[PDB]
Design a binder for this molecule. Structure first.
Ligand SMILES: [Zn+2]
Lengths: 422, 4
């Protein structure tokens, strides 16, 4: 299994994989109980009021001032039972993802995608960037800095605004300069979205009530894909967007969708990014990888005593798949760069995960959500690592009956309809 | 991000 221990939220802290921690949010916070489910990966069963100090209020604004398509519940994830269920739900989704070859490949890439040690001002020394670490309270009550790649945390005020969040650098654009940074994914396994089986209905903002439910494993995978891009520092700048001209409803409102999202979804959506802008990005990131190889060559010493310079230089040789000549000098091989870049951007896509999970899912990112449902994937009678909602040897096994909220109604509680509110 |  990807997660070797089946944590219970109330398990006693041990200061190693169950501990109270603080994150580098450049602010003050009380320690929060966290769980290390795998090397470099932690889960914090708390609403995210930490990564962004300006988003510490879970209470919903006045009804007359609510972004109409959203969902608020200040009480969600406030009790121990909820946190226990959250932990078990997130763990289950990681196992479901890991159980597929594609998911195993993606998670392996994520674990190997250690944020680059580029926090040194002296080019002759290699140093870690503190914001790519968390402070773990040890048994003696002292704090120790631990590097990590990924954190899964609960959503902020708007429960359904799932997204990758990461700490920036004063000058370096870590998610776009090849360096990478620790990714905090706001996510919840306790809710999902309804979509429509007919394309003309799903992509219309006035039709459909959300007959089918999105498998949360796909939703998490989508975020993990963004995380992969960001950990390897190849995310596409959000200012690079597609001025949608294939959907009258999007078009009539001049709506734009980032290339990063289209790339992440994959399939036909990825084609909205023309060959010219794509060759542009590829060259840009190729050069960023070149700079990393260069920085490694100039490194003559390392800061800290946790690992050796040789060990860390090798860690990044593996991450970026660099080549080492006779002088021990690192260089970026075009074939290897293209292969890795393509893996992270074209192989790891939402559309491909749908193929591996064998689930029904939106056919394009350019659609309109229909509703949000409350769910509970923890009980095996409701959802499994192997079949999600479409349980084998039951009436829910075929035709995505498990995702059919009308047939499998006992597994979904519609909390809000979005149709007609865009 | 999920989008619209
Ligand atoms: Zn997204």
């Amino acid at each position: 299994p990807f997660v070797n221990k089946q944590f219970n939220y109330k398990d006693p802290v041990n200061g190693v994989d169950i501990a109270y921690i603080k994150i580098p949010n450049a602010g003050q916070m009380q320690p929060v109980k966290a769980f290390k489910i795998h090397n470099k990966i932690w889960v914090i069963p708390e609403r995210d009021t930490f990564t962004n100090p300006e988003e510490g209020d879970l209470n919903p604004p006045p009804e007359a001032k609510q972004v109409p398509v959203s969902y608020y519940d200040s009480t969600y994830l406030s009790t121990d039972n909820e946190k226990d269920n959250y932990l078990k739900g997130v763990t289950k989704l990681f196992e479901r993802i890991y159980s597929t070859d594609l998911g195993r490949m993606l998670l392996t890439s994520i674990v190997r995608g250690i944020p680059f040690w580029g926090g040194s001002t002296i080019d002759t020394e290699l140093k870690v960037i503190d914001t790519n670490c968390i402070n773990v309270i040890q048994p003696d009550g002292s704090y120790r800095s631990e590097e990590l790649n990924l954190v899964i945390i609960g959503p902020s005020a708007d429960i359904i605004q799932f997204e990758c969040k990461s700490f920036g650098h004063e000058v370096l654009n870590l998610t776009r300069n090849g360096y990478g940074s620790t990714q905090y994914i706001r996510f919840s396994p306790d809710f999902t979205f309804g979509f429509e089986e007919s394309l003309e209905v799903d992509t219309n903002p006035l039709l459909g009530a959300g007959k089918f439910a999105t498998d949360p494993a796909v939703t998490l995978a989508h975020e993990l894909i963004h995380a992969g891009h960001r950990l390897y520092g190849i995310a596409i700048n959000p200012n690079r967007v597609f001025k949608v001209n294939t959907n009258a409803y999007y078009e009539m409102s001049g709506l734009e969708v980032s290339f990063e999202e289209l790339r992440t979804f994959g399939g036909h959506d990825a084609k909205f990014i023309d060959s010219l802008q794509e060759n542009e990005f590829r060259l840009y990131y190729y050069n960023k990888f070149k700079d990393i190889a260069s920085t490694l060559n100039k490194a003559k010493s390392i800061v800290g005593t946790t690992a050796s310079l040789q060990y860390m230089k090798n860690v990044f040789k593996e991450k970026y798949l660099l080549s080492e000549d006779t002088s021990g000098k690192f260089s970026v091989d075009k074939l290897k760069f293209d292969k890795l870049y393509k893996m992270l951007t074209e192989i790891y896509t939402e559309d491909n995960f749908v193929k591996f999970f064998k689930v029904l899912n939106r056919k394009t990112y350019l659609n309109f959500d229909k509703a949000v449902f409350k769910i509970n994937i923890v009980p095996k009678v409701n959802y499994t690592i192997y079949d999600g909602f479409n349980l084998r040897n039951t009436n829910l096994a075929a035709n995505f009956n498990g995702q059919n909220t009308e047939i499998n109604n006992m597994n979904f509680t519609k909390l809000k309809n979005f149709t007609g509110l865009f | 991000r999920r989008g619209l």
